[PDB]
Symmetry: C5
Subunit: 103 residues, 5 copies
């Protein structure tokens, strides 16, 4: 029922919006144990992760985590411009909660 990524992001603690307005510069993916994750970076210097699935995640988030990784990969590969990221700022690198792209 949120209508924008900013509305959605504001419903949670320890988050903020990063306005990226840019394609992904680098995409990294790991299948190493305990580090099953994706890392993206932008020309601005910003690094963000999709976190390893863990105890902080609720059950409904598990498929959503896998979806987000799918999305970032095809976004990287198509040079698609990301508009905004909603991130958790209590993790290093900051962790992706949501993404938006505009055309």
């Amino acid at each position: 029922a949120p209508q924008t990524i900013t509305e959605l992001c504001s419903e949670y603690r320890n988050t903020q919006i990063y306005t990226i307005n840019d394609k992904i510069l680098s995409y990294t993916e790991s299948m190493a144990g305990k580090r099953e994750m994706v890392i993206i970076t932008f020309k601005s210097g910003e690094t963000f992760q999709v976190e390893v699935p863990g105890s902080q995640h609720i059950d409904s988030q598990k498929k959503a985590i896998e979806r987000m990784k799918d999305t970032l990969r095809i976004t990287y590969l198509t040079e698609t411009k990301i508009d905004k990221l909603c991130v958790w700022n209590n993790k290093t690198p900051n962790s992706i909660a949501a993404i938006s792209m505009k055309n």
Copy 2:
């Protein structure tokens, strides 16, 4: 079974057909807990969502919900023109029930 989206839409209460005839303007995807959803917009101003899986959904709809988000993402990335949406209007933003594409 129904032969068009409008026939299918009319089988349900709280629905209407939006004629879009346009590609998606923005795509938003969230893996935040209890907001595992997708939101799209069009240059018309209209906003639509695929709802978070919930009690209103029957089991057969779970896979369908995942497919619909899959569909909206690739439709956005390929700039594919949507023809119509069948939406439930008892939700804000309106909730996607079905989609048709042509051209």
Copy 3:
């Protein structure tokens, strides 16, 4: 095993081969309860469905139904020429059993 769509199709009751030699004109996808289905049409005027999974299906068909819907979406999006369809003609619209594509 059969080597051709025509061979495969002949193994079944209530089927026939439609020769299409065309891309899909329209693609319709529904996540509406009891109508979790895809419908395609052609410039020829013909309309086909992938049926909702039900009691007429054996277990091994469940994953194959989902694949066929995936195939129809990507075939639509890339505007790929379908060669033939094997369909059950005891349904409305006729129900897709198999698909072939050639260049």
Copy 4:
């Protein structure tokens, strides 16, 4: 720990390598009961199948069978050149064990 498809193929009985060096001419996909399979052909006149999953397959092969079908479809759609196929020659059509693509 094979380094090539030819080495991998040589580890099994009733296999052989077909050198294709060509895109797929036709792709056929079936969700008919007991024939949940894919068939591909080439201009050469050669025909190959991904078999219906069955008791000849071990558990680890189930996901791999689904992957191979995904690969054949995307390979067909993008007109990607197949280098070699490793196939079991104790089935008709010959059954795909492995694929390589070179470009």
Copy 5:
């Protein structure tokens, strides 16, 4: 969590970074029993695998192994440039732990 592939790679024994700076020359995929795996090579003559799943992998890695193979396929097909590979060098061909791509 790590911010680059090199940082991630250095958390593990028997690894090293390969600088590839090149698209994949060949992609090989097997659904043969006990060789359910992917092998890629490059112009350079280098060869890498994603390993058959086994006891060396923890549960967490299962889904990530399937993703990595997904990533290698789409990367081959789009002719996408790989920057680095983190690889376990106690296997032949060396086994991919992580990938990075730039631009």
